[PDB]
Enzyme design. Sequence first.
Site, PDB file in Angstrom:
ATOM      1  CG  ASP A 126      -2.029   0.992   1.182  1.00  0.00           C
ATOM      2  OD1 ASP A 126      -1.925   1.990   0.442  1.00  0.00           O
ATOM      3  OD2 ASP A 126      -3.031   0.771   1.893  1.00  0.00           O
ATOM      4  NE  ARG A 128      -4.683   2.910  -0.009  1.00  0.00           N
ATOM      5  CZ  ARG A 128      -5.743   2.246   0.442  1.00  0.00           C
ATOM      6  NH1 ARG A 128      -6.969   2.718   0.237  1.00  0.00           N
ATOM      7  NH2 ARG A 128      -5.577   1.105   1.099  1.00  0.00           N
TER       8      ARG A 128
END
Lengths: 173, 173
Positions: A126, A128
């Site tokens: 991830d 983000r």
Amino acid sequence: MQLKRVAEAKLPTPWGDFLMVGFEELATGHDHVALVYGDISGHTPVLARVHSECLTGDALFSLRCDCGFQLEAALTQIAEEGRGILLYHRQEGRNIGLLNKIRAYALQDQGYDTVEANHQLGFAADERDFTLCADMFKLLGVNEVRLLTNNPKKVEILTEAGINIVERVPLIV
Amino acid sequence: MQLKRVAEAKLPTPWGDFLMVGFEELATGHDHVALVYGDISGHTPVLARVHSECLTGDALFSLRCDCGFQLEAALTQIAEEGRGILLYHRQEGRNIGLLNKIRAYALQDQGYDTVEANHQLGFAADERDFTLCADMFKLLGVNEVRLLTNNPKKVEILTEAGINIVERVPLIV
Ligand SMILES: [Zn+2]
Ligand SMILES: [Zn+2]
């Protein structure tokens, strides 16, 4: 502060009118959107959902994830509450982009899981940046947040990103 | 040729599996997607829909346009045919971008029409580049196209953009 608030207009939906607020990344011109339902002024904590964009699930009826399902569920729940915010965080595929997401999907079609696929493509599980969400809340004058999510881990992640979450509200799905 | 074909993977939907093909703009890295249903090989003209992205209508349940309605209708019709293509042309707001689209919407909330709003913001009524769609068809090995649309003017526009349209197929809505 990575963003600036640049425009707003009405977004009529089956659940009522949301005020759509557009944000711009100062360094890239890339956009993000917040949908604000009702009057979010006051000291009371504000109900909110952080939804990361998923073109396939949100728009193309994909059955390989629950993003579209979650998007509708959150908008419905916020409208029912009568006051709330949905942040549409535009970082497709956990921030690796749509094209890499398709490459990852191709590997997943072969038996790989999302973490393995991303790793082979050279990305973390991830990537983000949720501080962009903290920016949007601050620009909307929001302090305390009642976060819509069924995952306590998400509360930890967003709190670390600078969002003042005072309660976790289960997402009715 | 402004694009390159870079990846493909399965996109399961309520109407069956589409082959999702990702395209990349050589000059910007910006993406576009084609959803291919069934076997489009052969000399027979291929049924196809050109859908320009609309975040608000396609994903956010907007009632101020028919884009989401048209997206579902086209995917349904292509799957029913058993062979076809939907091009997801990523040029939001007739290519003025989402943020400017929100600014335009704000003016429309005040009584302006789309053409007036765009003009005041400094844009033409429609700034889209449909030759990107011709590129996707060529990269998919498609020549003759049976275009899904209820607007004969769209057939003229796309033909001018280099797409070999041999028939106009009404979009069942
Ligand atoms: Zn998804
Ligand atoms: Zn639209």
